[PDB]
């Protein structure tokens, strides 16, 4: 057990190991507050997050366990990993606070764009890394579910990492696939490919692609580009009311993407066409995208690793708050730090 030192910031007690110094409140939310600090062990700055009452309810306890299990499993150059996880508690009996530590990479995609105009090269490398980390993630049967520019950290060398996975079950909505946004059916990994598509388009034209004011307004902007649903997709929509509303819409034909992204790399326009397909079963997968001509200068099959098996059977267990809490404690207890470089 390291030596802890406790201090009060923004009216919140932070008790952490002495290795973390000069803690600076970076922000807060209903999830927990986050502090910026310098990690004297790696010599790198980091993000220290203190969870907000991890075990308030069965729901929260389980959600806490899911986040911890997910972060511990993530080991890839393009995905944020768990640098450290700790609790000042000396036993389960007193276990109550959970602290998560991750790398502070530089800036999110939005802050990059706001600073400079990107070259087609940058977009290539950026989208490539996104798909590279996504390939890793999807191979583990994990779906991020909330990809957007704010969840993309980029460093000075244009290197990228995916952060903040969606754990729950305008902005966000603008990069969401339609089957999710309106709960049309059980969705698959390709929802993230839909997000990548929206993000790529924005980087190329400097404009949000589907900035709808509300769900209906967005669905219309979307269906106007890709065309209205066909019978094949319709039969997949489980909601009878949903199907009913779709059929009520005035049919629309898919647009020629070349006519929307004038002046962009023909290869990037092709890739977009492949990602922005309305039927999720027809969208290109992460692995498939890495092999697309647009990324010819960065693609390397021997350097696009998949992940180990990720066991999610826990999602279907019905446990007591304290069982979920003890499970979480066990995970904290068994955490092995990443090799020092």
């Amino acid at each position: 057990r390291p030596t802890f030192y406790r201090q009060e910031l923004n009216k919140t007690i932070w008790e952490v190991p002495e290795r973390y110094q000069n803690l600076s409140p970076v922000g807060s939310g209903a999830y927990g507050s986050v502090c910026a600090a310098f990690d004297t062990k790696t010599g790198h700055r980091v993000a220290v997050k203190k969870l907000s009452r991890p075990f308030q309810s069965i729901i929260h306890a389980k959600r806490t366990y899911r986040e911890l299990r997910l972060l511990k499993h993530m080991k890839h150059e393009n995905v944020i990993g768990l640098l450290d996880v700790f609790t000042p508690a000396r036993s389960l009996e007193e276990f109550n606070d959970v602290y998560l530590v991750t790398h502070l990479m530089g800036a999110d995609l939005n802050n990059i764009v706001k600073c400079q105009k990107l070259t087609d090269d940058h977009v290539q490398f950026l989208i490539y890394q996104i798909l590279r980390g996504l390939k890793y993630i999807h191979s583990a049967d994990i779906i991020h579910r909330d990809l957007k520019p704010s969840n993309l950290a980029v460093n000075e060398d244009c290197e990228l990492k995916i952060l903040d996975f969606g754990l729950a079950r305008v902005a966000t909505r603008w990069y969401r696939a339609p089957e999710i946004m309106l709960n049309w059916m059980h969705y698959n990994q390709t929802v993230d490919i839909w997000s990548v598509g929206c993000i790529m388009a924005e980087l190329l034209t400097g404009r949000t692609l589907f900035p709808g004011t509300d769900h209906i307004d967005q669905l219309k902007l979307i269906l106007r580009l890709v065309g209205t649903p066909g019978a094949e997709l319709l039969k997949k929509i489980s909601s009878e009311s949903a199907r009913n509303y779709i059929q009520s819409l005035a049919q629309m034909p898919k647009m020629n993407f070349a006519n929307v992204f004038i002046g962009a790399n023909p290869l990037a326009v092709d890739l977009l066409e492949k990602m922005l397909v309305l039927d999720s079963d027809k969208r290109i997968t992460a692995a498939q995208a890495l092999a697309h001509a647009y990324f010819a200068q960065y693609h390397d099959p021997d350097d696009e690793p998949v992940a180990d098996p990720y066991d999610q059977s826990f999602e279907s267990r019905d446990l007591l708050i304290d069982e979920w809490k003890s499970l979480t404690y066990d995970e904290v207890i068994s955490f092995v730090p990443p090799p020092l470089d």
């Binding site: 990059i112 400079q116 490398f125 980029v154 460093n155 000075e156 060398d157 244009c158």
Partner: peptide, 10 residues
């Protein structure tokens, strides 16, 4: 590794 550079805001 790719010879790309980006400016990081303060």
């Amino acid at each position: 590794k790719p010879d790309l550079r980006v400016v990081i805001p303060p």
